[PDB]
Write a protein that binds this DNA or RNA. Structure first.
Lengths: 60, 60, 48
DNA sequence: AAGCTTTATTGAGGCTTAAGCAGTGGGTTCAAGGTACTA
DNA sequence: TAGTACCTTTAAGCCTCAATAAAGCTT
RNA sequence: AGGGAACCCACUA
C-alpha cells in the first residue's frame, strides 16, 4: 500500500499532465488513452523484483 | 492479445509475473462556461497489474 | 562555452556555463562534495 | 586624571574522514520513452 | 497519408567564526 | 583455446 499510494499519485499526475497538455491546445483527450497503465505495473514489478522499496531513480 | 488464466507454475516456467489486472471506474463530468454538465462513464478502465501473492484470495 | 564566447553572449550565460564546467571538472575528480548534487547518470547511478 | 583601542586566548559550530579478513552463490538493470521529420 | 531515426549510520580530529583583556596611545 | 560491468541480497569460516 505504501508503494501503491506513490504510484497512484504518479498515475494521477500523468493524467493531469496529459489532460493539461490536451486542454491548452483546446481539444478533447481520450481518457482510456490518458492512463499510463505501466506506472503501477512496472513500478510494483520493479520494487518486488529488486527489493528496493521506492522508485527506480531513488535506488540508493 | 487474448486473455488466458495464467497458472503460477506457467509463470514460474515462462518467467512471467503472476499479476492480476486492476480496473477502476472513472466518471468524467465536464463543466463549461455557460453550460451544463455531462457525466460519462468509463467503467473498468485498466490502470495496471497487481502482483498476486500465491495462495491468497485472488490467487488461482 | 567556447561557442557562446565566439558567438558572443550575456555575462549571465557565460557565468552559468562556467559554473557547469566547474561542476563537471570537480565531479570528474571528486563526486562526494557535500552541499552539491551527485554526478549521476541518466539511470540515476552516480558516476565513479 | 580615567577613557579609548589593539592583539593574543576561549567556546561553540562546521567540515572531514573512518569504521575486520577471506570466501561462495544468485538477481536485476544498465540501454528508453516522448518526439520531429520524409520517400 | 504510415513509418523509422534521433533528442534528451556515528565518533574523533582540525579549522574558523564570535567574544574577551592587559597595555599602549591619547586625554 | 576464451567478450562484461555495477549494485543488492543471502550465505561460509
Amino acid at each position: 500500500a505504501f508503494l501503491f499510494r506513490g504510484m497512484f499519485k504518479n498515475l494521477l499526475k500523468e493524467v493531469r499532465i496529459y489532460a493539461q497538455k490536451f486542454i491548452d491546445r483546446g481539444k478533447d483527450f481520450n481518457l482510456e488513452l490518458a492512463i499510463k497503465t505501466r506506472i503501477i505495473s512496472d513500478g510494483l514489478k520493479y520494487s518486488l523484483a529488486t527489493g528496493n522499496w521506492g522508485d527506480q531513480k531513488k535506488a540508493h | 492479445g487474448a486473455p488466458s488464466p495464467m497458472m503460477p507454475n506457467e509463470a514460474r516456467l515462462r518467467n512471467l509475473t503472476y499479476s492480476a489486472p486492476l480496473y477502476v471506474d472513472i466518471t468524467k463530468t465536464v463543466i463549461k462556461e455557460g453550460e451544463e454538465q455531462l457525466q460519462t462513464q468509463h467503467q473498468k478502465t485498466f490502470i495496471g497489474k497487481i502482483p498476486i501473492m500465491l495462495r491468497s484470495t485472488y490467487c488461482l | 562555452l567556447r561557442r557562446n564566447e565566439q558567438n558572443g553572449a550575456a555575462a549571465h550565460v557565460i557565468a552559468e556555463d562556467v559554473k557547469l564546467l566547474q561542476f563537471h571538472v570537480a565531479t570528474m575528480v571528486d563526486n562526494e562534495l557535500p552541499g552539491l548534487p551527485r554526478a549521476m547518470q541518466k539511470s540515476g547511478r552516480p558516476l565513479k
